[PDB]
């Protein structure tokens, strides 16, 4: 039992980490009520996969974690327990027994630049797939099957990173749409966070 733990840092940070390298902020030892969320912005989605937001104010969580992404446009639908795709095979992944849920809202006003924003990178291709909840910051030139190459670039030898060009005119379907993904566990351990009562 203490003051409100700083959701204002996770949900109101000046900058968000790129999709290929997402940070975690462990939150513990606080009492938080899920009521200030509705006073943020019109949510594009607020779907919850484990509980309902209305009843979420009367539960105790063993531990919580908050992520920070920059998705592109209408491709947000693939952030779900099971759906696959480019960012769901070579980037952040979700388990088949997910708990917690996803809060997404339009961020065109904050994360956009004239002529596009190049600060966000995503990894298109890998040697293989990746299990849920891992990161891969290693950057090396990738060949194509047979011909060996290193450092140099040319036929079938190219950098494994590509930069977004968001622009302010792409409209719906090609917009940042920031998103934060929580994670809960139901009464498995002594509760670090709870709700007012």
């Amino acid at each position, epitope marked *: 039992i203490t003051n409100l733990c700083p959701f204002d840092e996770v949900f109101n940070a*000046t*900058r968000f980490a790129s999709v290929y390298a997402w940070n975690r902020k462990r939150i513990s030892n606080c009492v938080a009520d899920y009521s200030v969320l509705y006073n943020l912005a019109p949510f594009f989605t607020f779907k919850c996969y484990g509980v309902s937001p209305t009843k979420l104010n009367d539960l105790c969580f063993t531990n919580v974690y908050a992520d920070s992404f920059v998705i592109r446009g209408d491709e947000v639908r693939q952030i779900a327990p099971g759906q696959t795709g480019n960012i769901a095979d070579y980037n952040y992944k979700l388990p088949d027994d997910f708990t917690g849920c996803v809060i997404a809202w339009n961020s*065109n006003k*904050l994360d956009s*630049k*004239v002529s596009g924003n190049y*600060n966000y990178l995503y990894r298109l291709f890998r040697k293989s797939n990746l299990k849920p909840f891992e990161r891969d910051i290693s950057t090396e030139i990738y060949q194509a099957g047979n011909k060996p190459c290193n450092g140099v670039a040319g036929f079938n030898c190219y950098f494994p990173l590509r930069s977004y060009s968001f622009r302010p*005119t792409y*409209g719906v379907g090609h917009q940042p749409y920031r998103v934060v993904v929580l994670s809960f566990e139901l009464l498995h351990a002594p509760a670090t966070v709870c709700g007012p009562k």
Partner: antibody
Amino acid sequence: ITLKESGPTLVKPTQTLTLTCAFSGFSLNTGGAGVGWIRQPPGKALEWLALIYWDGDKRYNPSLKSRLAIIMDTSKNRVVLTMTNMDPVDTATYYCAHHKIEYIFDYWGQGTLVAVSS
Amino acid sequence: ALTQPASVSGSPGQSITVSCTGTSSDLGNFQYVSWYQHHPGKAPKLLIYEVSKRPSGVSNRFSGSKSGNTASLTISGLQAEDEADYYCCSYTTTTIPVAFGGGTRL
């Protein structure tokens, strides 16, 4: 919330402009914000020139990027505009603005006008 | 760039409206259009943002709306001080990303 910029009112056409603009108090802890410069010759219409974000990103306009330069003080004291090869067709007044996405140009300044001294 | 009526006039009090328009191919648009007042010797200021919205500390007589490929602003209550230019701006997609258009004349 005050904006002000200073520059030489009389300029020899061969001289390169060096303009400074200072802002007194902004929400520096934000994203997708910055300061830009706009000019207006007598008559015709406005045209956008350039703007710089807080993250140091640099976004000159096409067809004029060769003759523009930007110096960032990085201490929030002011911002510097530099242009080369002054062209008498570009005689106009230059305005500072607090660029944003919601507000294209939120706040402006009184403006200073400069003309060639040939 | 953009096209706007060079000269607009009307009886004082009521019954006046100004609009902007442009090519749909160049301007993706869908958002982010604004109208600015100008005065001789005084700095411009914002009046409307996001097609039809009003910021704080502005008169209630000023508003507007857009339909199809025609953007417009609604003005009522003509006093002896509303004789100001109205510049309409947006984001384009070719060469210069910012177009200010021809403007108005009051």
